[PDB]
Design a protein around this ligand. Structure first.
Ligand SMILES: O=c1ccn([C@@H]2O[C@H](CO)[C@@H](O)[C@H]2O)c(=O)[nH]1
Ligand SMILES: O=c1ccn([C@@H]2O[C@H](CO)[C@@H](O)[C@H]2O)c(=O)[nH]1
Lengths: 440, 440
């Protein structure tokens, strides 16, 4: 039998679907009661008529409710449940510092992530560089690590918005990926199943972005903001720059290292700090832990200054089966490439642009990520000492230090790197790291 | 892989397909190498954006070439391969006389007709009320029949427009049914695959029509005329009337009986005559057998009145393994319902309107139709001596005589009929049998 067809017919003639009906349809996407054709139809239908904000909210909550949602009340905490979501990026290690910095300021951050099949390097794989680290605690242990440390970074769940999976899969063959209320839907669902009080969204801007245009990035951000708030989750969003690598390194172990050193104070990429700081501020103000930006940045600076943030990162690692002294002796534990040598340019001048995606694939082809879904990850390879847009380039200053497993992989990695970076006789201009703050 | 999705995406955002693209997509349907979701999405994307005439012809020509297309060129037949297709309704028995009448005048009529699903009762169903009648002759048998008697009415093979199968199947679940070029593609394909030199289309109008409103019934006819003629087959289309039972009987055996008495001359329903004649006239003119309408009606009335048409029907039944003397001894071969008993109105007045859809549904409920193809048809059930739009009603004017399986099903039929026929003091406006003719 099919009541779904009525629902499709309704929305097809530009009517607005009800909460009850919206919840019906996705639940049947979950259970395979609703045919694939029907789903495609609905998708193409929503692709045409768009969706009202109430429809966007209902769709999002319904998807969020297709699986388990984490309840954090009853279990007693004096603070806000807050997380960060992001459309990802090369060098974007921010969540590794940001979780502990906020946890330190009174927030409880249950960061759930998705390795998926992502071409892009995922943070979950970054943490597996750390010997012993377990990305799959059970519900109970997860509740505790949040309860004591204030942050844990864990593995995905089928228990989280399962409807989205058949939904997305169908969307992907029917040219309906590509609709804002639908994207807003697949993006927000999983993240909202964490039972958040608050949220901040990082929408990338630039060449290396999920959204190819500033206005397009800004549009998504607004949409996401409007829908998230509408679901009783205090939310804002930031556009941030992805015209180059965000950190000074790209990979796994190597990126984990940058974060310990960011938290300890040993080294803070000024752009990565700008981003990281901006995001945490949002988590604090939305979370009702800071009155304004000045207060948040003060609270934030301090936990970086007294080592209390680095401590939280350290404890977290231990809570999750890692070595308890990781912060103090990270090099002791972090896998080290066999060959680690600077790559230099075929010419002089200033870096005027970089292709972050090419760079990102250079790393992948170095064992740094997964070409095939069955491949293993070599956690030691990556780049460090990434030159930056602006940097003057001679023959004495390297584009990067390529860490490889052997000279064969190192050399290809160097051709890829030289090829992905563009030099110019005259310098390009500064841009902010953080652009617009979006409240609604 | 498929590139199917790039064709979906292309029509979404409103672009022409181009045939190479369309022919490729139709075959994937037939071969099953294209997902149900991709059929749905493309149907939906067409409902929104519609198709051009070159897209319309391509669509139909493609579905038409997905199976076998019949050729009679070999047979060296003297006259035109003609046929008629109707969107049907309660009482529409026209083909039973039309085929022998047109055959009687020089045309060859290969009516391959399709199954009764779509709800309601079919032409093939009616014919099988005849003991011995076989609707599935093999390719040669069909040919030598058409060659010798000039007309055969046979059921559909696996190989006639098989692409429409899954196509319409998924359309009917996704609410992508009401699309004229989709309908025009579906309907014409099967019929154009018969090898027709010419064709007339009977598009019903009213409460018993496929289309809801007159203007849509016109729109479809126009499309069909345009495409059929586009596709290489002379074609005209008559908007005919269906606000009441066209014949005087509804059912299977009873409708066959009426066919016989129509040809011989025992009786002819005036309105059944108008439609049957006008459709046959088109076939004669479209089919190069009459220069003008008057000659056409003259050649048809002739064979209706020299017992020729009746004899052609006699030979066609016999050819298909009906009893050879059916025209003369039909009462002996057709099955008698167990209960035949009249139904009257519960109020005096004039018949102001009747729900034809409901009436047809009443007959199916009696056991004269198939809800689910598994069902057995009781061939002797139905209505006869049907009252008409306009008639005056009093205690001795029955709405109809009902042929029911038993007392239980008769009351049920009686109640449906009462509930479907509405009376009034005021005699409403008297509409024609044929509203418009379309060659343009
Ligand atoms: O595109 C379509 C849709 C329906 N039909 C069939 O034709 C009948 C009406 O002519 C319908 O009930 C259905 O059975 C077609 O031939 N083509
Ligand atoms: O409107 C109608 C319907 C049927 N009949 C006749 O009723 C008889 C039924 O046995 C046949 O002579 C048939 O022609 C009529 O006279 N008028």
């Amino acid at each position: 039998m099919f009541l779904a067809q009525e629902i499709i017919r309704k929305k097809r003639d530009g009517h607005a679907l009800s909460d009850e009906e919206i919840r019906f349809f996705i639940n049947g996407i979950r259970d395979n009661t609703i045919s694939e054709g029907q789903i495609a139809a609905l998708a193409m239908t929503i692709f045409f008529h768009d969706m009202t904000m109430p429809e966007r909210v209902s769709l999002t909550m319904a998807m969020r409710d297709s699986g388990t949602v984490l309840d954090w009340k009853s279990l007693n905490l004096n603070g806000p449940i807050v997380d960060k979501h992001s459309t990802g990026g090369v060098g974007d290690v921010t969540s590794l510092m940001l979780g502990p910095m906020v946890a330190a300021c009174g927030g409880y951050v249950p960061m759930i992530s998705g390795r998926g099949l992502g071409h892009t390097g995922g943070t979950l794989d970054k943490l597996e560089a750390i010997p012993g680290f377990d990305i799959f605690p059970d519900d109970n242990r997860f509740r505790e690590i949040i309860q004591d440390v204030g942050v844990a970074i864990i593995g995905q769940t089928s228990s989280l918005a399962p409807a989205d999976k058949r939904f997305y899969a169908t969307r992907d063959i029917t040219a309906t990926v590509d609709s804002i209320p639908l994207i807003t839907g697949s993006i927000l669902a999983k993240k909202l199943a964490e039972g958040l009080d608050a949220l901040v969204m990082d929408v990338k801007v630039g060449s290396g972005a999920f959204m190819p245009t500033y206005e397009l990035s800004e549009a998504l951000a607004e949409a996401i903001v409007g829908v998230a708030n509408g679901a009783g989750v205090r939310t804002t969003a930031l556009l941030t720059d992805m015209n180059q690598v965000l950190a000074s390194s790209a990979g796994n172990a190597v990126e984990v290292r940058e974060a310990v050193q960011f938290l300890t104070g040993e080294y803070r990429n000024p752009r990565l700090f700008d981003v990281t700081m901006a995001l945490c501020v949002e988590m604090l103000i939305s979370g009702q832990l800071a009155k304004d930006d000045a207060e948040a940045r003060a609270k934030l600076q301090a936990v970086l200054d007294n080592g209390k943030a680095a401590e939280v990162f350290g404890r977290m690692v231990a809570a999750q089966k890692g070595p308890s002294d990781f912060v103090e002796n990270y090099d002791k534990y972090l896998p080290t490439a066999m060959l680690s040598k600077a790559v230099y340019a075929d010419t002089e001048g200033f870096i005027s642009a970089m292709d972050t995606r090419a760079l990102g694939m250079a790393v992948v082809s170095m064992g740094g990520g997964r070409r095939q879904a069955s491949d293993t990850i070599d956690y030691s390879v990556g780049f460090t000492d990434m030159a930056r847009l602006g940097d003057s380039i001679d023959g004495q200053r390297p584009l990067a230090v390529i860490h490889a497993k052997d000279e064969a992989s190192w050399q290809e990695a160097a051709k890829a790197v030289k090829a992905a970076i563009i030099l110019d006789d005259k310098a390009p201009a500064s841009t902010p790291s953080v652009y617009r703050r979006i409240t609604e």
